[PDB]
From a paper:
We therefore pursued the structure of the RBD in its unbound form. We solved the structure at 1.61 Å resolution using experimental phases obtained from a platinum derivative, and at 2.1 Å in a second crystal form by molecular replacement. Crystal forms 1 and 2 contain two and four molecules per asymmetric unit, respectively, and aligning these structures reveals variations in the N- and C-terminal residues and in several loops, reflecting the inherent flexibility of these regions. In contrast, the β5β6 loop, whose functional role is evoked below, is highly uniform in structure, suggesting a comparatively rigid element. The strands define a continuous sheet with simple up-down topology, forming an imperfect β barrel that juxtaposes strands 4 and 6 and extrudes strand 5. The C-terminal helix caps the barrel, packing against strands 1, 2, 5 and 6.
Numbering used by the authors: 322 to 448
The structure:
Amino acid sequence: EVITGEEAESNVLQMQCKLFVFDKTSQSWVERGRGLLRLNDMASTDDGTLQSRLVMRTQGSLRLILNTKLWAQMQIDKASEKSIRITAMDTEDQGVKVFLISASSKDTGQLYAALHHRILALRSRVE
Ligand SMILES: [Cl-]
Protein backbone atom coordinates (compact mmCIF):
# COMPACT_ATOMS: atom_id res chain seq x y z
CA GLU A 1 0.00 0.00 0.00
CA VAL A 2 2.99 2.27 0.62
CA ILE A 3 5.43 3.32 -2.10
CA THR A 4 8.98 2.97 -0.79
CA GLY A 5 10.87 3.90 -3.95
CA GLU A 6 12.63 0.54 -4.03
CA GLU A 7 9.88 -1.18 -6.02
CA ALA A 8 10.94 -3.44 -8.88
CA GLU A 9 10.62 -1.91 -12.34
CA SER A 10 8.61 -3.34 -15.23
CA ASN A 11 9.17 -1.24 -18.34
CA VAL A 12 5.94 -1.06 -20.33
CA LEU A 13 7.40 0.91 -23.24
CA GLN A 14 10.31 3.03 -24.43
CA MET A 15 9.84 5.62 -27.18
CA GLN A 16 11.77 8.38 -28.93
CA CYS A 17 10.00 11.72 -28.52
CA LYS A 18 10.14 15.46 -27.87
CA LEU A 19 8.88 16.86 -24.58
CA PHE A 20 7.29 20.30 -24.33
CA VAL A 21 5.99 22.02 -21.21
CA PHE A 22 3.36 24.76 -21.20
CA ASP A 23 4.65 28.15 -20.06
CA LYS A 24 1.81 29.86 -18.18
CA THR A 25 3.62 33.20 -18.46
CA SER A 26 3.92 33.23 -22.25
CA GLN A 27 0.99 30.90 -22.94
CA SER A 28 3.23 28.85 -25.24
CA TRP A 29 4.94 25.46 -25.47
CA VAL A 30 8.59 25.33 -24.42
CA GLU A 31 10.82 22.44 -25.47
CA ARG A 32 12.32 20.73 -22.43
CA GLY A 33 14.24 18.14 -24.44
CA ARG A 34 14.22 15.00 -26.56
CA GLY A 35 15.21 11.39 -25.96
CA LEU A 36 13.69 8.16 -24.68
CA LEU A 37 10.41 8.37 -22.78
CA ARG A 38 9.71 5.40 -20.50
CA LEU A 39 6.49 4.18 -18.91
CA ASN A 40 7.17 1.92 -15.93
CA ASP A 41 4.97 -0.25 -13.73
CA MET A 42 6.36 -0.44 -10.20
CA ALA A 43 5.94 -3.80 -8.46
CA SER A 44 5.51 -4.47 -4.75
CA THR A 45 6.84 -7.54 -2.94
CA ASP A 46 3.39 -9.03 -3.58
CA ASP A 47 3.68 -8.38 -7.32
CA GLY A 48 1.06 -5.68 -6.92
CA THR A 49 1.48 -2.59 -9.08
CA LEU A 50 1.61 0.21 -6.52
CA GLN A 51 2.09 2.93 -9.12
CA SER A 52 3.09 3.74 -12.69
CA ARG A 53 5.62 6.38 -13.68
CA LEU A 54 6.57 8.33 -16.78
CA VAL A 55 10.31 8.98 -16.78
CA MET A 56 12.38 10.80 -19.38
CA ARG A 57 16.01 11.82 -19.68
CA THR A 58 17.14 14.12 -22.48
CA GLN A 59 19.67 12.47 -24.79
CA GLY A 60 23.36 13.26 -24.37
CA SER A 61 23.41 14.87 -20.93
CA LEU A 62 20.72 12.46 -19.73
CA ARG A 63 19.35 15.18 -17.48
CA LEU A 64 16.01 14.17 -15.97
CA ILE A 65 13.27 16.22 -17.65
CA LEU A 66 10.20 14.22 -16.63
CA ASN A 67 9.58 12.02 -13.59
CA THR A 68 5.92 11.71 -12.67
CA LYS A 69 3.58 9.12 -11.22
CA LEU A 70 0.25 8.48 -12.88
CA TRP A 71 -2.83 9.39 -10.85
CA ALA A 72 -6.58 8.84 -11.25
CA GLN A 73 -7.53 12.48 -11.89
CA MET A 74 -4.82 12.84 -14.53
CA GLN A 75 -6.00 14.63 -17.68
CA ILE A 76 -4.86 13.17 -21.00
CA ASP A 77 -5.85 13.82 -24.60
CA LYS A 78 -4.49 12.79 -27.98
CA ALA A 79 -3.95 16.33 -29.26
CA SER A 80 -3.03 14.95 -32.70
CA GLU A 81 -1.98 11.69 -34.36
CA LYS A 82 1.56 12.55 -33.28
CA SER A 83 1.14 14.35 -29.94
CA ILE A 84 -0.27 13.76 -26.47
CA ARG A 85 -1.18 16.39 -23.89
CA ILE A 86 -1.01 15.45 -20.21
CA THR A 87 -1.13 16.95 -16.74
CA ALA A 88 1.89 15.70 -14.78
CA MET A 89 3.82 16.35 -11.56
CA ASP A 90 7.03 18.28 -12.27
CA THR A 91 10.59 17.30 -11.62
CA GLU A 92 11.74 19.20 -8.52
CA ASP A 93 8.58 18.99 -6.37
CA GLN A 94 7.18 21.85 -8.41
CA GLY A 95 3.49 21.06 -8.91
CA VAL A 96 1.11 20.09 -11.71
CA LYS A 97 2.08 21.21 -15.21
CA VAL A 98 0.70 20.52 -18.67
CA PHE A 99 3.04 18.66 -21.01
CA LEU A 100 3.11 17.86 -24.71
CA ILE A 101 4.68 14.59 -25.84
CA SER A 102 5.53 14.56 -29.55
CA ALA A 103 6.39 11.30 -31.32
CA SER A 104 5.72 9.00 -34.26
CA SER A 105 2.12 8.17 -35.11
CA LYS A 106 2.56 4.56 -33.97
CA ASP A 107 4.27 5.34 -30.66
CA THR A 108 1.70 8.04 -29.88
CA GLY A 109 -1.17 5.60 -30.36
CA GLN A 110 0.40 2.93 -28.17
CA LEU A 111 1.40 5.42 -25.47
CA TYR A 112 -2.03 7.06 -25.30
CA ALA A 113 -3.73 3.69 -24.85
CA ALA A 114 -1.23 2.53 -22.23
CA LEU A 115 -1.66 5.72 -20.20
CA HIS A 116 -5.43 5.98 -20.67
CA HIS A 117 -6.04 2.40 -19.58
CA ARG A 118 -3.83 2.83 -16.52
CA ILE A 119 -5.70 6.01 -15.56
CA LEU A 120 -9.02 4.16 -15.82
CA ALA A 121 -7.60 1.31 -13.73
CA LEU A 122 -6.48 3.78 -11.07
CA ARG A 123 -10.04 5.08 -10.86
CA SER A 124 -11.17 1.55 -9.99
CA ARG A 125 -8.96 1.65 -6.92
CA VAL A 126 -11.68 2.75 -4.50
CA GLU A 127 -12.18 0.59 -1.38
CL1 LIG B 1 4.92 12.49 -8.88
